[PDB]
């Protein structure tokens, strides 16, 4: 039975890790984990992994 | 690229193209950061002197966004061998930093365990390049992308006339006429996860292009994440 990172990526935007019995989210370089500990926020312009619109 | 689609404006901004002294592309690469290009070790044997071109989608037309960069350092995996194409990975450091802009942007390097559990278990990856449009064809003057299914490891080994090492994986189609091809080598294999694109492979080799019962073989980037990190100092 899917649990933690196996259940919809632990609700993380990017990286999900299991510590103790708990989901820990993190982000690629150039992103910061949001206050909710789940979303990843670009720190500046042209963050990795994003197609360009301007 | 055999089959697939054009990269539309902004869609494949991490594509790099290794160009020879005659200005012809011979291999692809992936932008990792302002200074570093990921490519295949075996591409380095395909020309004496080369540069890297980013921001190009149509080789026949100046679209404005193009930039040529000189290579300062070639970092080739020391365990690479032409015999097996094992350890087919290399990192290039550029003389001048890439200026990110429209059609010019890095792909994200994932973390190993998560990439392998979560990225490489997705249905498909995306391979892209200016390579041949079919086995006997000429090179595309248009940058193309193709969605390629991850292929079961044991099916791939059975399908292959040559050894599939732990540093390779397979992707593509059994009979459907879509594949990477000659000239796409060294280029990006990425996986999308929630609208963010992570590098998951390097176009490495194949027995022809889109041949029935044969798959595309890619360097397993996730096995080389500490190596790449080291190489980017
Ligand atoms: C050392 C071992 C593992 N080898 C590495 C290089 C290698 N290249 C091999 C090969 O079959 N090459 C070959 C033969 C002909 C033709 O004769 O009509 C025409 C084009 C080619 C090159 C095609 C090519 O890049 N394919 C391709 C490359 C990467 C991916 Cl992901 C998918 C397809 S077979 C092979 C085995
Ligand atoms: Ca152009
Ligand atoms: Ca096939």
Domain boundaries, chain A: 1-54
The residues facing B129 across adjacent strands are: B144
CA distance A40 to A10: 14
CA distance B4 to B107: 20
The residues facing B19 across adjacent strands are: B25, B51
Counted residue by residue, chain B has a size of: 233
Q: What is the DSSP letter of B118?
A: I
What residues of chain A, 6 to 25, have a C-beta less than 8 Å from chain B? 6, 9, 13-17
Residue A14 CA: distances (Å) to CA of A33, B74, B166, B175, B181 = 10, 31, 25, 34, 31
CA distance B209 to B180: 7
CA distance B120 to B103: 25
The yes-or-no answer on residue B9 being catalytic is: no
**Which helix (H) or strand (E) element contains residue B71?**
strand B67-76
B-chain CB neighbours of A50 within 8 Å are 105, 195-197
Distance of CA B48 to the CA centre of its chain: 20
Spatial CB neighbours of B103, under 8 Å, sequence gap ≥ 6: A52, B9, B10, B12, B13, B54, B55, B56, B57, B63, B65
Distance of CA B225 to the CA centre of its chain: 15
Residue B149 CA: distances (Å) to CA of A38, B71, B169 = 28, 33, 11
> Would you list the domain boundaries of chain B?
1-12+107-222, 13-106+223-233
Instruction: Give the CA angle between residues B170, B141, B203 to the nearest 5°.
Output: 15
CA distance B4 to B84: 28
Instruction: Give the CA angle between residues B161, B164, B166 to the nearest 5°.
Output: 170
Q: List phi, psi (to 5°) of B29.
A: -160, 170
Candidates B105, B118, B193; nearest CB to A46: B105
CA distance A14 to chain B (A): 8
Residue with token string 């966004």 = B65
CA distance B121 to B59: 34
Cα Rg for chain A, rounded, in angstroms?
Answer: 13
Residue B43 CA: distances (Å) to CA of B48, B103, B114, B115, B186 = 11, 23, 29, 25, 7
Spatial CB neighbours of A19, under 8 Å, sequence gap ≥ 6: none
Q: State the CATH class of domain B13-106+223-233.
A: mainly beta
* A-B contacts (CB, under 8 Å): 69
Q: Which of B88, B128, B140, B189 is catalytic?
A: B88
Q: Which two tokens stand for residue B217?
A: 């073989």
Give yes or no for a contact between B129 and B1, defined as CB atoms under 8 angstroms apart. yes
Residue with token string 């450091």 = B93
Q: Whose CA is nearest to atom 3 of ligand 1?
A: B84
Q: Please, which experimental method was used?
A: X-ray
CB contact under 8 A, A51 and B11: yes
Residue with token string 């994200």 = B108
Q: Which of B50, B61, B45 is nearest to B16 (CA)?
A: B50
The tally of CA atoms less than 13 A away on the side-chain side of residue B73 is: 10
Q: Which architecture does CATH list for A1-54? A: Ribbon (2.10)
CA distance B129 to B137: 14
Instruction: Give the CA angle between residues A37, A39, A41 to the nearest 5°.
Output: 110
CA distance B120 to B114: 9
Give yes or no for a contact between A12 and A18, defined as CB atoms under 8 angstroms apart. no
Residue of B196, B198, B228, B229 best to disrupt the A interface, most CBs of A under 10 A: B196
Report resolution (Å) to 1 decimal: 2.2
**Which helix (H) or strand (E) element contains residue B114?**
helix B112-114
Residue A23 CA: distances (Å) to CA of B97, B158, B227 = 37, 38, 27
SS3 of B154, please? helix
Tell me, which fold does domain B1-12+107-222 have in CATH? Thrombin, subunit H (2.40.10)
């Amino acid at each position: 039975t899917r649990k933690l990172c196996s259940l919809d990526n632990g609700d993380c935007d990017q990286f999900c890790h299991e510590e103790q019995n708990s989901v820990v989210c993190s982000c690629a370089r150039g992103y910061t984990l949001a206050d909710n500990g789940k979303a990843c926020i670009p720190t500046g312009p042209y963050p990795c992994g994003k197609q360009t619109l301007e | 690229i055999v089959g697939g689609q054009e990269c539309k404006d902004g869609e494949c901004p991490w594509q790099a193209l290794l160009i020879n002294e005659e200005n012809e592309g011979f291999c692809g690469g992936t932008i990792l950061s302002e200074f570093y290009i990921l490519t295949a070790a075996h591409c380095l044997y395909q020309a004496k002197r080369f540069k890297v071109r980013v921001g190009d989608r149509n080789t026949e037309q100046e679209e404005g966004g193009e930039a040529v960069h000189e290579v300062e350092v070639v970092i080739k995996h020391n365990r690479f061998t032409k015999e097996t194409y094992d350890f087919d990975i290399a990192v290039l450091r550029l003389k001048t930093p890439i200026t990110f802009r429209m059609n010019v942007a890095p792909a994200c390097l994932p973390e190993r365990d998560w990439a392998e559990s979560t990225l490489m278990t997705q249905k498909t990856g995306i391979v892209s390049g200016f390579g041949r449009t079919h086995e006997k064809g000429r090179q595309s003057t248009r940058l193309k992308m193709l969605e390629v299914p991850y292929v079961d490891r044991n099916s791939c080994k059975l399908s292959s006339s040559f050894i599939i090492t732990q540093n390779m994986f397979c992707a593509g189609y059994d009979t459907k006429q879509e594949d990477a091809c000659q000239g796409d080598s060294g280029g990006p294999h990425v996986t999308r996860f929630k609208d963010t694109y992570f590098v998951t492979g390097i176009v490495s080799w194949g027995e022809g292009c889109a041949r029935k019962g044969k798959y595309g073989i890619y360097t397993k980037v996730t096995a080389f994440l500490k190596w790449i990190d080291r190489s980017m100092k």
